[PDB]
Design a protein around this ligand. Structure first.
Ligand code: AKG
Ligand code: AKG
Ligand code: NI
Ligand code: NI
Lengths: 288, 288
């Protein structure tokens, strides 16, 4: 069977979204440089270590879906300089997203999270994303353009043996889900910095960690239209941090009003005809 | 032709949503008491007077749709004690919304706005709401449960001559829109405090002000699922005001995390497994 299409972030930028639109998946080679992967890893390292189990009883909003061998940490902006500056302003990310979401309008981050899988982490069931947070998406028409996409960035090597992600190519167009089998999958073998890009309709799953020794880590960036509510909030991020960001990064984190693609768009998160950033005189690019 | 069903907020509460589900519209008599209408009016009065034209060039997010004879003021929580306390905690509103949105999960205010129409304000074109802000809704399946509803509360008398709202009964179920005519409409004749409730699929329009003397005013409350982004932001509302509200009112204004109806819901606007209100130790019901 055919493998996931591989593309250059450098030479094939315009080809990335068309490829996903057709096959439901693509691997973007060197989506993040090794320098950014390295800095990102240093910055999130301690936060993944302290993270309790997904359904820890201390939690207000426990995650009962992820395995006990999974650690997920989100709201990455206050944690990671590399995240807030390099990845939130990614030229490649923003081209793909504008290609993807132009029919709808503005987009933002629904969730940016580092996921680390412990040795012997079992495979996830084959699934589509967004079903534990946005029931609305199941009521969209089959042909509606994707309202969210997910960049699964490798922060350590993805191998067949250490649980590299599985995808079913073309599955984003499936309606009848009775050929859903692991038999129909191909793997996303990736070096750190490579990214598997999928849509919210692409059938996929994290793979089984078989070695009992390797730890797999990824940065999952779910980008979605500004008409959908993010899974995470940046409301509690200190203002000096927010004010250190670019206007674009501020918008991505819900610290700006948003716009739809309606010809006479009246806007989202406005305040009596004016933006959030104007009203609160939110500054931008003020270093710490 | 058949008139818009009229219901008591007191005796027919359980019948309100079933009625709208069937006919696409219903009039809730005495939705707000005259006391609340009176206080609401006193509190918003000066803010409607100072409001410029919808597309005023000073505005960051101008509204190019509404007439120049329309004044709309939103983000009502800091303006109106009656709004933030009485209407945001409305027993009748919350029963209807939970009846309406239980399939999806939590709901919140997409926009609470006072609209005042000047004498001789022309009729609006027949329309469905949400099309200038949420293109996503047009891509929902025809039978998807409504993801937003609109309470059109009279703050002054609605008469045939002063431009009472028109609705086409049953139009929320229409797909083919070629019988859209003013010939197919009925009026929402209302006393102050009565509310016309419609869905985001109900075909309707503000009526023509014919007297050249009367000013018509309304409180439009668009309640919608927490998975959809509000048209307005409460991000800039002073914290003593937010902390004066009930937990429920805080949620409605985006000052709390939200939950979907997914059996293993992972939540919306969360912060590493915990709520906004916990993280920011947001207090509640602290009077001013
Ligand atoms: O672990 C992976 O490679 C995929 C993770 C995933 O699909 C998810 O957690 O939703
Ligand atoms: O003025 C009215 O009665 C209806 C207003 C309306 O439908 C709107 O502004 O969307
Ligand atoms: Ni997934
Ligand atoms: Ni309308």
């Amino acid at each position: 069977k055919s493998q996931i299409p591989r593309l250059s972030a450098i030479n094939d930028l315009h080809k990335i979204w068309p490829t996903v639109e057709e096959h439901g998946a693509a691997i973007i080679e060197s989506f993040l440089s090794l320098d950014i992967v390295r800095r990102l890893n240093e910055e999130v390292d301690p936060f993944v270590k302290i993270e309790p189990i997904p359904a820890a009883k201390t939690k207000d909003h426990p995650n009962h879906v992820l395995s006990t061998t999974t650690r997920l940490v989100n709201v990455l902006a206050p944690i990671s300089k590399a995240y807030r500056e390099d990845v939130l302003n990614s030229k490649v990310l923003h081209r793909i997203c504008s290609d993807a979401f132009h029919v709808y309008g503005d987009y933002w981050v629904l969730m940016g999270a580092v996921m680390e899988l412990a040795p012997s982490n079992p495979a996830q069931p084959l699934h589509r994303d967004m079903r534990f947070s946005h029931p609305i998406v199941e009521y969209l028409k089959p042909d509606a353009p994707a309202t969210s996409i997910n960049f699964l960035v490798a922060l350590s090597p993805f191998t067949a043996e250490n649980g590299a992600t599985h995808v079913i190519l073309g599955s984003h167009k499936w309606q009848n889900l009775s050929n859903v089998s692991m038999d129909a999958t191909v793997r996303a073998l990736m070096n750190p910095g490579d990214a598997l890009l999928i849509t919210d309709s692409t059938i996929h799953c994290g793979g089984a960690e078989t070695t009992g020794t390797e730890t797999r880590r990824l940065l999952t960036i779910t980008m979605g239209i500004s008409q959908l509510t993010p899974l995470e909030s940046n409301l509690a991020v200190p203002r000096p941090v927010i004010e250190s960001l670019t206007p674009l990064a501020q918008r991505l984190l819900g610290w700006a009003s948003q716009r739809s693609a309606a010809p006479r768009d009246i806007g989202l998160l406005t305040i009596r005809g004016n933006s959030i950033e104007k009203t609160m005189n939110l500054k931008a690019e003020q270093p710490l």
